[PDB]
């Protein structure tokens, strides 16, 4: 059985790096991370000092 | 990094109040709740005494 | 077996009341109404005297 | 010919009132507003003092 | 309030059995499981000895 | 001209059998049933004695 | 309250004429037809003597 | 950079002519119109003397 | 077993004729073409001498 | 690099068997088939002697 | 109230840079740009000297 | 007439490079490649030594 968690990573550099940011966090806390699916992308402008790229991923991990 | 939980709130009054019901529950248990996105709405009729409005939200919270 | 009818309710007050308007009509004519799913919402402005909220629902009822 | 503008209204009270907030703004600036279609709903929590309901609408108006 | 977890069940037999596999896991760990919604189906071929059917479900459970 | 009715069939056995359950009901009442399109699948757990598979189909039939 | 029926019209000439074919049938049987929304289009080739254009419409009519 | 405007053209003749009606209006007012994407089609029946075909297009034009 | 090819037909006349243009090409090369499903429509303006209607179809054909 | 082919399998028994029917055909002709994604399901009724389940899959295979 | 404009940015380097290209243009002309949502991505090949990445964004800005 | 092939490119570096990987393969084998549309993005983690970015594109090419 696989389970997915819905995470939004951030980066000041790129959409790829923002996806990596989410996956890194998943790997900090979860065992057996197997894949991530991009489900949304966007950019925060008017709340931050530098544009911040956001990539939302479903991160799948194997249970047991 | 943000994480989302998928919650369905209920209310006997309105769709807005049903969204609030989910957000209230998230805030009981989670720190740093930042936003909610409505993803579905419906009404339970033939299981309850009074019509029950349901609003399903992805509730986003900041990790750390 | 359940069947659904696709109804658009109207209200001069709210989206919730417009959903109720459709469900009320279903219950006038059908037995065993069990649930409604919101599928669209909108507002009529330039055909009516007062803004009219519209909520479109699939209304499910049990056959037999 | 109709044209649509994509507006997000806000309210501290309800999703219906947030839709009205967008439509009111359209009517301030545009002639012949005829209808609005809800395309998204959400709630701002962690940037404001009170929860703020957001309703995004395509607001249609007749040209000429 | 209901919460959903996003699980992918597997089976060497059928899509129905793969859905059951996810629901079984949810029921091992959660109280008050009430319903599951199928959101995706697929088949793993080139990583396994026998074709493996996958059915992804949102599994809803009642909180409290 | 074809018309479609939106039916949800149920089965304690499988998603295929639940689709058949809806089609059987359509054929009880309608002439010239020609095809069915699956539009949703799910499982009822916390209202029934045994898990109940649901398959929702648009059932098309030829008019005249 | 409005209700919609899901009809597929056919024509050997065009997608527009196929939509008209469905609307014509609705108007044969229903009072107060107000609008139609195109939801699908296709072409039957390998069952007919001439290509047959199909346009599927939700046809809305006012109740009462 | 390209920008899109969301226009609904109308015609008493066809869906193609309704798309043209929107594009014609865009070209009246905008320079460097490059393409249009159909996003919706429908028919107005119960507000007009003759059925009126509507085709909604995103009309893209090049900035500068 | 059926297979589909994803083709975009073009016409200077109409969306229907653009669909036909794709189907004609499929029939030049493939046996047992059975149906086509429209999946997108658009108009090329700023690359051609005359507006060019495009209709994208999945064209299904029977294998063997 | 992976490529996908869009195939509809058929079966008189089940949706799972119809998916298998498509995958079997892919494996007859292609090397390195790795996975299949279900994209549609339906039932043919009014053209065949027995109901025929159809499952449409994108079948992915590795190039080289 | 927020308003969105639908812009397609271009870059010879990356999808991230193409999003930035659109946002830069919005910021040239608009005050109070707050966020951008990616809605499409693609690559122009057969009209340009070098592959050109395109990222389409809804760019939101606060009115007043 | 245009045709599209559905390809998934891979890269250890970025989503942009993964799109390029698919387009490069198309250009190895096909004449008159004109454009690519991104339809999915994801990351393989638990099958490879280094995270592998995947970008799925419909690659369009002109026939004849
Ligand atoms: Cl989710
Ligand atoms: Cl329907
Ligand atoms: Cl838009
Ligand atoms: Cl495809
Ligand atoms: Mg930096
Ligand atoms: Mg998002
Ligand atoms: Mg009360
Ligand atoms: Mg729901
Ligand atoms: Mg009042
Ligand atoms: Mg609607
Ligand atoms: Mg207040
Ligand atoms: Mg939104
Ligand atoms: Mg076995
Ligand atoms: Mg999936
Ligand atoms: Mg049994
Ligand atoms: Mg459903
Ligand atoms: Mg003729
Ligand atoms: Mg269809
Ligand atoms: Mg005329
Ligand atoms: Mg529309
Ligand atoms: Mg001509
Ligand atoms: Mg397209
Ligand atoms: Mg048999
Ligand atoms: Mg299909
Ligand atoms: Mg360069
Ligand atoms: Mg696009
Ligand atoms: Mg490297
Ligand atoms: Mg994918
Ligand atoms: Na989730
Ligand atoms: Na219906
Ligand atoms: Na717009
Ligand atoms: Na394809």
Coordinates of N, CA and C in Angstrom, one line a residue, chain A:
Chain A
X1 N 0.9 -1.2 0.0 CA 0.0 0.0 0.0 C 0.9 1.2 0.0
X2 N 0.6 2.2 -0.8 CA 1.2 3.5 -0.8 C 0.3 4.6 -0.2
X3 N 0.9 5.6 0.4 CA 0.2 6.7 0.9 C 0.8 8.0 0.3
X4 N 0.0 9.0 0.1 CA 0.5 10.3 -0.4 C 0.3 11.4 0.6
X5 N 1.3 12.3 0.7 CA 1.1 13.5 1.5 C 1.2 14.7 0.5
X6 N 0.4 15.7 0.7 CA 0.3 16.9 -0.2 C 1.1 18.0 0.3
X7 N 2.3 18.2 -0.3 CA 3.3 19.2 0.2 C 3.5 20.3 -0.8
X8 N 3.7 21.5 -0.3 CA 4.2 22.6 -1.2 C 5.6 23.0 -0.8
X9 N 6.5 22.8 -1.7 CA 7.9 23.2 -1.5 C 8.1 24.7 -2.0
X10 N 9.1 25.3 -1.5 CA 9.4 26.7 -2.0 C 10.9 26.9 -2.3
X11 N 11.2 27.8 -3.2 CA 12.5 28.1 -3.6 C 12.6 29.5 -4.2
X12 N 13.7 30.2 -3.9 CA 13.9 31.5 -4.6 C 14.6 31.3 -6.0
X13 N 14.8 30.1 -6.4 CA 15.5 29.8 -7.7 C 14.7 29.3 -8.8
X14 N 13.9 28.2 -8.6 CA 13.2 27.5 -9.7 C 12.1 26.6 -9.2
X15 N 11.2 26.3 -10.2 CA 10.2 25.3 -9.9 C 10.7 23.9 -9.5
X16 N 11.8 23.5 -10.2 CA 12.4 22.2 -9.9 C 12.9 22.2 -8.5
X17 N 13.6 23.3 -8.0 CA 14.2 23.4 -6.7 C 13.0 23.4 -5.7
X18 N 11.9 24.0 -6.0 CA 10.8 24.0 -5.1 C 10.2 22.6 -4.9
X19 N 10.1 21.8 -6.0 CA 9.7 20.4 -5.8 C 10.7 19.7 -4.9
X20 N 12.0 19.9 -5.1 CA 13.0 19.2 -4.3 C 12.8 19.6 -2.9
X21 N 12.5 20.8 -2.6 CA 12.3 21.3 -1.2 C 11.2 20.5 -0.5
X22 N 10.1 20.2 -1.2 CA 9.1 19.4 -0.6 C 9.5 17.9 -0.4
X23 N 10.2 17.4 -1.4 CA 10.6 16.0 -1.4 C 11.7 15.8 -0.2
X24 N 12.6 16.8 -0.1 CA 13.6 16.8 1.0 C 12.9 16.7 2.4
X25 N 11.8 17.5 2.6 CA 11.1 17.5 3.8 C 10.4 16.1 4.1
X26 N 9.8 15.5 3.0 CA 9.2 14.2 3.1 C 10.2 13.2 3.6
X27 N 11.4 13.2 2.9 CA 12.5 12.3 3.2 C 13.1 12.4 4.6
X28 N 12.9 13.6 5.2 CA 13.4 13.9 6.6 C 12.6 13.1 7.6
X29 N 11.3 12.8 7.3 CA 10.3 12.3 8.2 C 9.7 10.9 7.9
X30 N 9.9 10.6 6.6 CA 9.2 9.3 6.1 C 10.2 8.4 5.5
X31 N 10.0 7.1 5.7 CA 10.7 6.1 5.1 C 10.0 5.7 3.8
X32 N 10.8 5.1 2.9 CA 10.4 4.5 1.6 C 9.6 5.5 0.7
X33 N 10.1 6.7 0.6 CA 9.6 7.6 -0.4 C 9.9 7.1 -1.8
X34 N 8.9 7.0 -2.7 CA 9.1 6.4 -4.0 C 8.9 7.3 -5.2
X35 N 8.0 8.3 -5.1 CA 7.8 9.2 -6.2 C 7.0 10.4 -5.8
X36 N 7.0 11.4 -6.7 CA 6.3 12.6 -6.4 C 5.6 13.0 -7.7
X37 N 4.4 13.6 -7.6 CA 3.6 14.0 -8.7 C 3.4 15.5 -8.6
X38 N 3.7 16.3 -9.6 CA 3.4 17.7 -9.5 C 2.0 18.0 -9.7
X39 N 1.3 18.7 -8.8 CA -0.1 19.0 -9.0 C -0.4 20.5 -9.1
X40 N 0.5 21.4 -8.8 CA 0.3 22.8 -9.0 C 1.7 23.6 -8.9
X41 N 1.7 24.7 -9.5 CA 2.9 25.6 -9.5 C 2.5 27.0 -9.4
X42 N 3.2 27.9 -8.7 CA 2.9 29.3 -8.6 C 4.0 30.1 -8.1
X43 N 3.8 31.4 -7.9 CA 4.9 32.3 -7.5 C 4.3 33.3 -6.5
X44 N 4.9 33.4 -5.3 CA 4.5 34.4 -4.3 C 5.4 35.6 -4.6
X45 N 4.7 36.8 -4.7 CA 5.3 38.0 -5.1 C 5.2 39.1 -4.0
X46 N 3.9 39.4 -3.6 CA 3.6 40.5 -2.7 C 3.4 40.1 -1.3
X47 N 4.3 39.3 -0.8 CA 4.4 38.9 0.7 C 5.9 38.7 1.1
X48 N 6.7 38.6 0.1 CA 8.1 38.2 0.3 C 9.1 39.2 -0.3
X49 N 10.4 39.2 0.1 CA 11.4 40.1 -0.4 C 11.9 39.8 -1.8
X50 N 12.0 38.5 -2.1 CA 12.3 38.0 -3.4 C 11.2 37.1 -3.9
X51 N 10.9 37.1 -5.2 CA 9.9 36.1 -5.7 C 10.2 34.8 -5.2
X52 N 9.1 34.0 -4.8 CA 9.3 32.7 -4.3 C 8.5 31.7 -5.1
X53 N 9.2 30.8 -5.8 CA 8.5 29.7 -6.6 C 8.0 28.7 -5.6
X54 N 6.7 28.2 -5.9 CA 6.1 27.2 -5.1 C 5.7 26.1 -6.1
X55 N 6.1 24.8 -5.7 CA 5.6 23.6 -6.4 C 5.0 22.7 -5.5
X56 N 3.7 22.4 -5.7 CA 3.0 21.5 -4.9 C 3.1 20.1 -5.5
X57 N 3.4 19.1 -4.6 CA 3.6 17.7 -5.0 C 2.8 16.8 -4.1
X58 N 2.2 15.7 -4.7 CA 1.8 14.6 -3.9 C 3.0 13.7 -3.8
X59 N 3.5 13.5 -2.6 CA 4.7 12.6 -2.4 C 4.2 11.3 -1.9
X60 N 4.5 10.2 -2.7 CA 4.1 8.8 -2.4 C 5.2 8.1 -1.6
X61 N 4.8 7.3 -0.6 CA 5.7 6.5 0.1 C 5.0 5.1 0.4
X62 N 5.9 4.1 0.4 CA 5.4 2.8 0.7 C 5.2 2.5 2.2
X63 N 4.0 2.0 2.5 CA 3.7 1.6 3.9 C 4.4 0.3 4.3
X64 N 4.8 0.2 5.5 CA 5.5 -1.0 6.1 C 7.0 -1.1 5.6

